[PDB]
Amino acid sequence: TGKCGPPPPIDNGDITSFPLSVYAPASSVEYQCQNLYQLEGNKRITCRNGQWSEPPKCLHPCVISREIMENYNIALRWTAKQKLYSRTGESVEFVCKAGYRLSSRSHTLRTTCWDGKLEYPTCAK
Amino acid sequence: TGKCGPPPPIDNGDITSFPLSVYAPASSVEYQCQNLYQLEGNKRITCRNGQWSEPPKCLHPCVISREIMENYNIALRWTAKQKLYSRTGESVEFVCKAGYRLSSRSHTLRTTCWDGKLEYPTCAK
Amino acid sequence: TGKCGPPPPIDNGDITSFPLSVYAPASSVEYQCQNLYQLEGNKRITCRNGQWSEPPKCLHPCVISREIMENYNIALRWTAKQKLYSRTGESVEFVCKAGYRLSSRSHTLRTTCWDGKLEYPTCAK
Amino acid sequence: TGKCGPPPPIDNGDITSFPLSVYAPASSVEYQCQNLYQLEGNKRITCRNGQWSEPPKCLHPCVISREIMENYNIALRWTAKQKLYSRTGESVEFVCKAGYRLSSRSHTLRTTCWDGKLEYPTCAK
To answer: At A55, which CATH number?
Structure first.
């Protein structure tokens, strides 16, 4: 009893083996997330009692926004080290443009990407 | 006026060029969807008036379900040609298991994958 | 002294971070191989004295050949578990077709994929 | 007569459909190359007389070298538009560093990536 069918696709990830039509109970397969996506949780799913266990999630990278940076009077700190796309968990460092200073209540100039979202610092003249 | 920043990531797809920090108005880039995903719409985005145009969508493949097929008394027709994963737009063909016949109001035995969803035929004894 | 430039592409693999134009000595990045490719060695490269260390290799999966199997009078053992593509290190199990037996000096019916190569068993009438 | 087995893997590319164990004569499948790789030739292979036709090639992107650029006294022209990786067919534009000029017999400052190779311009003091 308890065989499973082919393992479920997940967004932005792939299993590391060729899918089969049927799997014995206790069988397992593993996922990997695509390059700039961070795999959250356990990469392995196991077949038990007719069902696969819960696959991991592939957490989204963050893209910097020209519009937001212009609006907030900030720029990337490191011109030769531009993290245009950042992994979830990775930090991006900004600076105030010439003639501006960190606003009160602003997030720090260094900020961390989480699943697509960057909380940008804000500078004022 | 009207330059754009780095192009947006999309689920299950990738741009075909290396991202740049800034793009001139009229610049374009192109997406491709990952292998079993079907690109819906125009693959190209263009920068105009400070904004990228709308990226395409990557339509999901369909995975056959052992549980559903067992419940509906069906199996794949072609044992040597098993579309365990099907592309959006692609058809999958089932048969009634021995001793069963297509129920009334059942979908045809041939059915088409659309963005992850297969409408399965149902057989009754 | 000793900064590095952008990390080298490798066949069938990708780095897990966004490439930068320059890296400080002691910086590191990591590779992942594409889904059915097996990463051989250490996934991490480190920048020292102006040079990246040696990247890993992505070992090739194996595809079964209809022509070879027909010529050798063999078939896959498990009709519902067809490893049409196998990872390096993974085993594939064949059987002699009806009316044939393992030849003398033949490889065992179970055989392991290594970097694209399967050593097929041979059956004789 | 003339059925084919599963289609061949190619470096840095993937087929766009789920592989099957057997294909009828006249069947076809299609490849796509991974994002910064340029597909050379016809993306489609067709099964005839027991054999697949010849798959396309995925032409390699080019990575700029810090060491070579330093040795040749050049830098990227566009600081905000750095093609750290370039597609085959795509051009990269350099400039002489301050205090240098294009050497005689040097390649032009604009140069095209071909299957991994850039022919770099050289500047002299």
So the answer is: 2.10.70.10
